[PDB]
Amino acid sequence: KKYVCVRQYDLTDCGAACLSSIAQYYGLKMSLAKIREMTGTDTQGTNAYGLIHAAKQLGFSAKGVKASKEDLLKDFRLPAIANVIVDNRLAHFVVIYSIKNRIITVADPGKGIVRYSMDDFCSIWTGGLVLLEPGEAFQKGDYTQNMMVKFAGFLKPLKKTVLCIFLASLLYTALGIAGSFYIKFLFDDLIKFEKLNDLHIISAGFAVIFLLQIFLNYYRSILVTKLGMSIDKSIMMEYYSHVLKLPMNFFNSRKVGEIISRFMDASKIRQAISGATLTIMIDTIMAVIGGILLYIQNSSLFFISFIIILLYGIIVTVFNKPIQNANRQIMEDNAKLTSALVESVKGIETIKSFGAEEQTEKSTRDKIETVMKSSFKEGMLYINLSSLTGIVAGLGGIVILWAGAYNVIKGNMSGGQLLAFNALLAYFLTPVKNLIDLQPLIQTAVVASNRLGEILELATEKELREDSDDFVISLKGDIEFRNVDFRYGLRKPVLKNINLTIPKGKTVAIVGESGSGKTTLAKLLMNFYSPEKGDILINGHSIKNISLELIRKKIAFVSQDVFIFSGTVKENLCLGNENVDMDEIIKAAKMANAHDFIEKLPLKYDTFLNESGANLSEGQKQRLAIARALLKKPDILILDEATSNLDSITENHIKDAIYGLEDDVTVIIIAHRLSTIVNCDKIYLLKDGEIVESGSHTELIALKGCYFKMWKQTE
Amino acid sequence: KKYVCVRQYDLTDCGAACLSSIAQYYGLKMSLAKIREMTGTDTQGTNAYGLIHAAKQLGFSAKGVKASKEDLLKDFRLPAIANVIVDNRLAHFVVIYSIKNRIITVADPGKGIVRYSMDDFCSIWTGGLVLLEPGEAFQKGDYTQNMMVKFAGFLKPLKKTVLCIFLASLLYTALGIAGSFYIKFLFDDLIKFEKLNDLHIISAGFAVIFLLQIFLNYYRSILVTKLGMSIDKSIMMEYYSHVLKLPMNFFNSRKVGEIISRFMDASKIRQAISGATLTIMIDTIMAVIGGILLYIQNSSLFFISFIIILLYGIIVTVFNKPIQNANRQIMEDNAKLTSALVESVKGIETIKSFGAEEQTEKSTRDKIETVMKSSFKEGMLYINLSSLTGIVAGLGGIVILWAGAYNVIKGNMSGGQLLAFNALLAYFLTPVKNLIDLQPLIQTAVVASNRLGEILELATEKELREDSDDFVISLKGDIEFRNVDFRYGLRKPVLKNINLTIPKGKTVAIVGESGSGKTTLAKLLMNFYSPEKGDILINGHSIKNISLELIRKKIAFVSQDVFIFSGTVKENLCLGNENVDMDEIIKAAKMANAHDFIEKLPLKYDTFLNESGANLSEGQKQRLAIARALLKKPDILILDEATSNLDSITENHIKDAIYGLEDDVTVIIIAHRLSTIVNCDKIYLLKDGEIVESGSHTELIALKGCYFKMWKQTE
Amino acid sequence: NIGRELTDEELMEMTGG
Amino acid sequence: NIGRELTDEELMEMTGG
Ligand SMILES: Nc1ncnc2c1ncn2[C@@H]1O[C@H](COP(=O)(O)OP(=O)(O)OP(=O)(O)O)[C@@H](O)[C@H]1O
Ligand SMILES: Nc1ncnc2c1ncn2[C@@H]1O[C@H](COP(=O)(O)OP(=O)(O)OP(=O)(O)O)[C@@H](O)[C@H]1O
Ligand SMILES: [Mg+2]
Ligand SMILES: [Mg+2]
Numbered sequence A, B: 001k002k003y004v005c006v007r008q009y010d011l012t013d014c015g016a017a018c019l020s021s022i023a024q025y026y027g028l029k030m031s032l033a034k035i036r037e038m039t040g041t042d043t044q045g046t047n048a049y050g051l052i053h054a055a056k057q058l059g060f061s062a063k064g065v066k067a068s069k070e071d072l073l074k075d076f077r078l079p080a081i082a083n084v085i086v087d088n089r090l091a092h093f094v095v096i097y098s099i100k101n102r103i104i105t106v107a108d109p110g111k112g113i114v115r116y117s118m119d120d121f122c123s124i125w126t127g128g129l130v131l132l133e134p135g136e137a138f139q140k141g142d143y144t145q146n147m148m149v150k151f152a153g154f155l156k157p158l159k160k161t162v163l164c165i166f167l168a169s170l171l172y173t174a175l176g177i178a179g180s181f182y183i184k185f186l187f188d189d190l191i192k193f194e195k196l197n198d199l200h201i202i203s204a205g206f207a208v209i210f211l212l213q214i215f216l217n218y219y220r221s222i223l224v225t226k227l228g229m230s231i232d233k234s235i236m237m238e239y240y241s242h243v244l245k246l247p248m249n250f251f252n253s254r255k256v257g258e259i260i261s262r263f264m265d266a267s268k269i270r271q272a273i274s275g276a277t278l279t280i281m282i283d284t285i286m287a288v289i290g291g292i293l294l295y296i297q298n299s300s301l302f303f304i305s306f307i308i309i310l311l312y313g314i315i316v317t318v319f320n321k322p323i324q325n326a327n328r329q330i331m332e333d334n335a336k337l338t339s340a341l342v343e344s345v346k347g348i349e350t351i352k353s354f355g356a357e358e359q360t361e362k363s364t365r366d367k368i369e370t371v372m373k374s375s376f377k378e379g380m381l382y383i384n385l386s387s388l389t390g391i392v393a394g395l396g397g398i399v400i401l402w403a404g405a406y407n408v409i410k411g412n413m414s415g416g417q418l419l420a421f422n423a424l425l426a427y428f429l430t431p432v433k434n435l436i437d438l439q440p441l442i443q444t445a446v447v448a449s450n451r452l453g454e455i456l457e458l459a460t461e462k463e464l465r466e467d468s469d470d471f472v473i474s475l476k477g478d479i480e481f482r483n484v485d486f487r488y489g490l491r492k493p494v495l496k497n498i499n500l501t502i503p504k505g506k507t508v509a510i511v512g513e514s515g516s517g518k519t520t521l522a523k524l525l526m527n528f529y530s531p532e533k534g535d536i537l538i539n540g541h542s543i544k545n546i547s548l549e550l551i552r553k554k555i556a557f558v559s560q561d562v563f564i565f566s567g568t569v570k571e572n573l574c575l576g577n578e579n580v581d582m583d584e585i586i587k588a589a590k591m592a593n594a595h596d597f598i599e600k601l602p603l604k605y606d607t608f609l610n611e612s613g614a615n616l617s618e619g620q621k622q623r624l625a626i627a628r629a630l631l632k633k634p635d636i637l638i639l640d641e642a643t644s645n646l647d648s649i650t651e652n653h654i655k656d657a658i659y660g661l662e663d664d665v666t667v668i669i670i671a672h673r674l675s676t677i678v679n680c681d682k683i684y685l686l687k688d689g690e691i692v693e694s695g696s697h698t699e700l701i702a703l704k705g706c707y708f709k710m711w712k713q714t715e
Numbered sequence C, D: 001n002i003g004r005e006l007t008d009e010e011l012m013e014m015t016g017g
Helices: A015-026 A032-039 A048-058 A118-124 A148-155 A159-190 A199-245 A248-253 A256-261 A266-297 A300-346 A348-354 A357-409 A415-427 A429-452 A519-525 A569-573 A582-591 A618-631 A648-659 A706-714 B015-026 B032-039 B048-058 B118-124 B147-155 B159-190 B199-245 B248-253 B256-261 B266-297 B299-346 B348-354 B357-409 B415-427 B429-452 B518-525 B548-553 B569-573 B582-592 B618-631 B648-661 B697-702 B707-714 C008-013 D008-013
Strands: A060-065 A080-086 A090-099 A104-107 A114-116 A129-134 A479-485 A500-502 A507-512 A533-538 A555-557 A636-639 A666-672 A682-686 A693-695 B060-065 B080-086 B090-099 B104-107 B114-116 B129-134 B479-485 B499-502 B508-512 B533-538 B555-557 B636-639 B666-670 B682-687 B690-695
Touching: A015 A032, A015 A048, A015 A080, A015 A090, A032 A048, A032 A248, A048 A060, A048 A080, A048 A129, A048 C008, A080 A118, A104 A118, A114 A118, A148 A199, A148 A266, A148 A429, A159 A199, A159 A266, A159 A415, A159 B357, A199 A266, A199 B299, A199 B357, A248 B348, A256 B299, A266 A300, A266 A415, A266 A429, A300 A348, A300 A357, A300 A429, A300 B199, A300 B256, A348 A357, A348 B248, A348 B555, A357 A415, A357 B159, A357 B199, A415 A429, A519 A636, A519 A666, A555 A618, A555 B348, A569 A582, A569 A618, A582 A618, A618 A636, A618 A648, A682 A706, A693 A706, B015 B032, B015 B048, B015 B080, B015 B090, B032 B048, B032 B248, B048 B060, B048 B129, B048 D008, B080 B118, B104 B118, B114 B118, B147 B199, B147 B266, B147 B429, B159 B199, B159 B266, B159 B415, B199 B266, B266 B299, B266 B415, B266 B429, B299 B348, B299 B357, B299 B429, B348 B357, B357 B415, B415 B429, B479 B518, B508 B518, B518 B666, B548 B555, B555 B618, B569 B582, B569 B618, B582 B618, B582 B648, B618 B636, B682 B697, B690 B697, B697 B707
Parallel strands: A507 A666, A507 A682, A555 A636, A636 A666, B508 B666, B508 B682, B555 B636, B636 B666
Antiparallel strands: A060 A129, A080 A090, A080 A129, A090 A104, A104 A114, A479 A500, A479 A533, A682 A693, B060 B129, B080 B090, B080 B129, B090 B104, B104 B114, B479 B499, B479 B533, B682 B690
């Protein structure tokens, strides 16, 4: 059939692009976001086992093989996925389509489709050919749709403004056409017959027409900018709302940069919907009117303009692609130089200590030369295009004028009519030129519409569960785990049958070592992630049936890295909650000993937090999360690693606070390095993976296990 | 007299701007970089004590006062510095110049000079008027120079290219002027007399002239882009080299963002030197030629064009300032929205746990509305300017055409001459319009030259210290600290008077607590910072008499946050000292046990890392650090905290290797961990910034004091 | 089939980017 | 003088930005 390659929206994903291209070749189109979710792409990069598992899921009978140097066997199916090394820096998955004696068809997802020599491919391709076939369950079905017909829906409530803009454009065109015959009337009647006292009147009349064109232009500009802002704001706001609604997998898979980057491309979509839709209509109509007038006025002078337009279109279409192929390389070379500069100035300690002053200077000089060369290539392309367009335009103008003079000589047209023709050409060349150069805008808008329109199609967090809570209004109960299994994306499982039982109102501590999954127990206990195998029970009830908002309202969760957002202490400390009395904050800050800095700050509680704890320290920022947690009235408190306190009295006061609870609540404490482990109701030691040592106070040490040896090692 | 206000380049330096403004008012100009160095600004912000110290240094009799609400007294001098609060978010030093009954002249360094009402001002400024007077040691003098005549020096070696560009532009102008009479010749001779067989010849002749203008345009474009790239590269490279030469105070005072930002403004300087100097000459000459031609052709039609130029210039000059005043606010409102978005998407754990999905949505909607309003204000300004310019241009065109017709009616001018005048106006209006709109470019270039050109005027690290090689050929020597005092800036002295001696000890161990300044001691030993009082002696010789290169290459250092460059292990490991044989690297790896993870890597030693070695964990990162340190084979080693992982066998091997050296080289180990220093010979305990106990561990335990309690607390 | 099939850990060691 | 003079620490607590 036909070779198809799909581009990559993000630098992180390559296997998803290859798998989507292969599926499209076999006749199945899916949104790249779904493909990424199936493969479990991480921020570091795509794993080939993700590709093999996604292929199995889609119905492709697939297998990964480490092939030798020889690529001449005939009995194996194509296309297939193999990895390559980008000039021996990093890996990059690509799909090969057909092999020849010395030509290999290599569809690079990063850049189009290319042909490689056998030796160069064998050097770049380390191994790992992923052979794929349809397994008779593969059904030729495509879930892909049109995003633009969905984003253009936002133009429906604003039909009045669009229609008014169109009417204003039509009247602007009419006045501009009418005012262009001033030179014809001047050089055909007013000067030849020297009809004075009419020149003043006609001049005033044509002045009035121009003081009316500017009003229409002003009004149209006001309306169009208002429309553009109104639609751009709505696009941005819908995207932000849906992102805020997305589950945690979306935030773990993608970085912050990509999510914020899908926020600046709403302007590109707006340009197509607002600018590139109105301009099509108005320029098409105005070009048609101008062309008809030009043809009626003289056909021979019209053919010359038509030829000029054709030449300009041919030149622009030819020069379109080399410009992008040169603009991408400049971006790559600037991205390298900026990283080099930041890396160098960040590590001045090491550079100065080791004496590498000349080496970094030479390296930066070379990178600057490379980016200069790429910019010069783009400059040469622009100069070539501009020179060709200038030659075409100037020769067209001279030819039109000469042919007009030749027509006038034979008594076919009048000189004033020639000047009117020259004036009218501005209303036929400009509209068509706009549509000729509009194609790159439409293409980039279509590209950017598939980067935001695929995110909106992911299943939002709340929907995938059934909610029913008429029977129970409380979280109080026991925590049970039944062979709960969790797996970060597609990697080695962490949580594995963590049989647990937490009676109500028990002091619980989970100790372990770095690497062992211990906060993951809390994360599943708070319904952030979902266990694929097994389930957890509260009060003998499944967490999946529990409503979404209640399971995150009655459970308080401190984080290892506490987050402090820009604002005042009051609003930050009462995040999420609203309509509270000022005494609750006072007592909450008294439990966590916040007053020790409350009097220190210039304002009691309205002190602003600069950017994020810029004037604060870690040992102080730590003392805010507990206050908020206790403020939320937690029926289940999950106190995470509260390190860097550096205050014994604060520890023994805060510890007492937990013991002295007015309302019975299941406290779950995450501890590390055997810190503040004196006495608890239940103590569980996660040495690695599987839970092994689950013993109470003066019961764990007895096991003579690792807890024992560590406990008599500490003291 | 003159109310001078200095505009800050960076957001952090406010006190420096205020002090420079006051000094300029009394008649003394300094480079803002030097004022900033004298006042000692931290990245967090300026200090008032720094301002009082700088005023004392410059000779100003100065004092800070906590003024009350009442400020109606006459008996205190102005101008004076007070701090205000920017809508109750953050502090901002500003200078007041004159007080009235209800008007206060407040010269905000951030934005021009403003007038405040008494109530609003008294609400805005907290306290601390800083009063300054000349102290009779104050000598007037202007130290500033025109850095532009210094950056234009780069144009001197490239005089041939500039002259060739100028000659090409002159010939381009000549051909353009000559080719503009085609319409005059057409409508005055060739059509009136119907002289056929001459129309073809003249058309071909004017076609040849236009196919020669494009060649000159092409050649000029090539030369000008080559010149621009060549000068921009030189500016960038000089700045980068000098930054790499600057001492560590410059890097501690400034952030990474500012240093990299002074790298993108070389383009602005190049635009003035390369573009805005050639354009001045060529456009002035071509405008003079066009104006003379128009005046000779007809004076009456020339006056109308001159009036149009005057109107356009007036409109542009009037509208220049409000456009900048509106563009700055848009940048501020985007900088707020971007920070809000990044902060929100970064802390999704807390937002989802607390259920604040609606609060953040509302806040972002409000910020989006604010930025839309600011953009609409800028849009209204642009539309107003464009409408006024369009009215002026259109009315000028109509009036010129009508006056030309009126002149033709009374037998004063010919119609072809009128068309020639209309064609020629394009060679007079365009050059003058270019010079009219060139003023903002010159102004921003001048601003950008004061922010890159002041950095180049700082004294680099190498020039200060004097040295003689005859004294001590070697570097390794007994270390003696004599009364060393040091503070990072104008803050609490980190180091008080201390006395140390390292008499060729096998091991030296410096232990203390966080914030004591243990690493700062070694940082001062390596001559990164200089001691205020006292000195350090090696072989009874001051470090200030030793060459920088020898003292910098013979001292091996390990940082807390080890830095790994983006390159292969081979080049990363031996940076600074190239031409190193494989045996040295292999034995350094053997001593550091670097081989253990090397076998797992796909390539033994040429493996290319990712950005800063993200995939590599910190455990092997430290091992790379010790390998890099020991590769130099130095005289003195300063080994910082190498805790790494609980794999104690690696630390045991490292200690065994160091003991197996059995050499006369000295080792200074900085470690907070108490157990690892059990086998050390000389142990210095630095508490509260002063050395307290000195000697071996066994006698330190029997000395009671304070070491005893921690030693028997750990074990 | 072309060569020798791979195990899950051999797929683990192979990554992209 | 205008009002009450300040010590070094009172200047220290005052910062800018
Ligand atoms: N995105 C991720 N963030 C954190 N850990 C992850 C992630 N993906 C996989 N993991 C794995 O999950 C485990 C983290 O365990 P967990 O965070 O529960 O323990 P912890 O001891 O509290 O953590 P820490 O490593 O901060 O001490 C590790 O094995 C880690 O490799
Ligand atoms: N730019 C700066 N760099 C380092 N320290 C600074 C700086 N400005 C102020 N300080 C302060 O100076 C003191 C020096 O601390 P330093 O980091 O040298 O401590 P240390 O005892 O060597 O150990 P640690 O690395 O654990 O902090 C600290 O109180 C620190 O807050
Ligand atoms: Mg953890
Ligand atoms: Mg330190």
